[PDB]
Design a protein around this ligand. Structure first.
Ligand SMILES: Cn1c(=O)c2c(ncn2C)n(C)c1=O
Lengths: 194, 49
């Protein structure tokens, strides 16, 4: 409804989403550091799915290097920090799904029950490259405990998967698409790399 | 791809091949996700690590 599309573009809308991106990052980060409030996190992700999808609607039917798509990448430049945070939240919990399961890791876990200990976990993710120190401190937080050595490695890995089976998908579509209608554009490139 | 699982360990694997370092570019790569002391065998360099 192109006549309607320009109305939202010339509207006090971008300053609303950039604020949303900011608040989405911290609670998504704060909520993960607990096991009882995990239930609220699920419907918080559902809000992310219903927020990014409307950005697709603005972008549908757009011309290459158009004016609507210019503000899409422009709004991210200011709302960057928030975005990046989200993308990270995904990687982190998608690289763990692999680590746990890698021969190496299964060599640190030494116990019948099927649980690793905090110390070990640290050593593992640290012995392996990546996973900068402070991130390791965070991961030994969103984890559970039980004698500080019952971090049942399994669950953790396959916990925040399904809930975000999407979100991560619908940001992949977002970065790719703009990355086709607004071709030559450095700003965006950076995002796609992360 | 099996008769050739015999040479991997050999101490002259890169014989008629310029890169006499292959065994050290695999330890450096697939050397974290897999025990630095596990790929330190199926590529010879026993203890060479
Ligand atoms: C060391 N070296 C190389 O690095 C190389 C080569 N041919 C191609 N390359 C890259 N030959 C014959 C070679 O001896």
């Amino acid at each position: 409804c192109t006549g309607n599309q320009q109305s939202l573009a010339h509207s006090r809308l971008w300053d609303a989403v950039v604020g949303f991106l900011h608040v989405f990052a911290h609670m998504m980060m704060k909520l993960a550091q607990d096991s009882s409030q995990i239930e609220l996190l699920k419907e918080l992700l559902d809000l992310q799915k219903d927020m990014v999808v409307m950005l697709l609607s603005l972008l549908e039917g757009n011309v290459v290097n158009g004016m609507i798509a210019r503000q899409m990448v422009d709004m991210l430049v200011e709302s960057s920090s928030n975005v990046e945070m989200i993308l990270k939240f995904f990687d982190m919990f998608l690289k763990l799904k692999d680590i746990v399961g890698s021969e190496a890791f299964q060599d640190y876990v030494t116990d019948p029950r099927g649980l690793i200990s905090k110390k070990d976990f640290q050593k593992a993710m640290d012995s392996q490259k990546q996973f900068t120190g402070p991130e390791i401190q965070f991961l030994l937080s969103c984890s559970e405990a039980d004698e500080n050595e019952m971090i049942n490695f399994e669950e953790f890995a396959n916990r925040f998967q399904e809930p975000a089976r999407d979100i991560g998908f619908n940001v992949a579509v977002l970065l790719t698409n703009l990355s086709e209608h607004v071709p030559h554009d450095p700003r965006l490139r950076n995002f796609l790399e992360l | 791809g099996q008769w050739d699982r015999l040479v991997l360990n050999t101490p002259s694997f890169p014989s008629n091949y310029w890169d006499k370092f292959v065994k050290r570019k695999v330890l450096d790569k697939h050397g974290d996700i897999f025990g630095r002391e596990r790929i330190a065998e199926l590529l010879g360099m026993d203890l060479a690590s």
